[PDB]
């Protein structure tokens, strides 16, 4: 799985250990080993949500499976919870795009996961 | 809707008010309330279009609905027109990926839109 | 086609000529003319892969067609090879999301490719 968060919160406001925490919580949430979890945090971005430049986040989770109605509600409670607690971003200023990838459409290690 | 523009135009060339203009015009074009519009502009990027590093933009618009052939043509005229007028990027050096999201696949406010 | 690479490798480790090399090799691999290939490299990123922060890359290739199981394996060999040779990233620390776009869902030059 690949989780990306783009935010206007400054780099200094991202706690040490945030990438590790995302890695662990997403391994637990998706049930995939941590070795397959990739995380990417992009602070200091020029962005707005609803016209406002208060703190916000635009995110995506790409996963081969483990994407669906109930799972995505649970992921959203988890991830909004982490962004609120660690980055002080209100959950209603977060979008997360969930993307269920086909294994043949994910490249890794000179081939695909098919 | 979530609109992202990545460009090699320098930050100083992005005019004040641009994120607001994008928000307002995307709300009108998609019909969505402006409170649901998120916008994100990433200048100073290392990119090329057609092998050339003249000004260009690589963009995406994700939306729950309001994506389709005729709608997307209209969005492209709007968004290319704004990028030409405000960032001086030629329309034929812009790509925009349009992505129709299922409501169950968009997290927001601790849940999803389903 | 649009190819994006996000990486924690520093900007000074991206060699001169890399965006051109990506443009040329992707033109040859997808069979589309280089005038239509866009490329984007984003260095110095805050990211982890598998819980650690040795060099890694999170990438995407969006293309109107020319996406499929065998094609994508060949693209992955090519692109992991380039990232290893030029940015010293291990192929087992690269993820590439392949996305087959409908022509009507790609904006360009004030309209779409439909």
Author numbering:
A (entry chain B), B (entry chain C), C (entry chain A): 1 to 114
What did the study's authors say about this model?
Macrophage migration inhibitory factor (MIF) is an inflammatory protein with various non-overlapping functions. Human MIF is a homotrimer with an enzymatic cavity between two subunits with Pro1 as a catalytic base, activates the receptors CD74, CXCR2, and CXCR4, has functional interactions in the cytosol, and is reported to be a nuclease. MIF forms a homotrimeric structure with a solvent channel coincident with its 3-fold axis and possesses three putative catalytic cavities formed at the interface between each of two adjacent subunits.
We hypothesized that this mutation would enable disulfide stabilized dimers within the MIF trimers, providing a more comprehensive understanding of the structural, dynamic, and functional impact of Cys99 substitution. The two conformations of the thiol groups in this study do not interact with other protein atoms nor do they induce large conformational changes. Though the shared Cβ atom for WT, Y99A, Y99C MIF align very well, the radius of the solvent channel opening where the three Y99C residues appear is 3.4 Å and similar to Y99A (3.6 Å), in contrast to WT MIF (1.4 Å) as calculated by MOLEonline. Though we observed a solvent channel opening for Y99C similar to that of Y99A, the catalytic activity of the Y99C homotrimers has reduced (55%) catalytic efficiency relative to WT MIF and compared to Y99A (77%). The Y99C homotrimer abolished CD74 activation in vivo but possessed reduced enzymatic activity, supporting the role of Tyr99 as a common allosteric node within two distinct allosteric pathways.
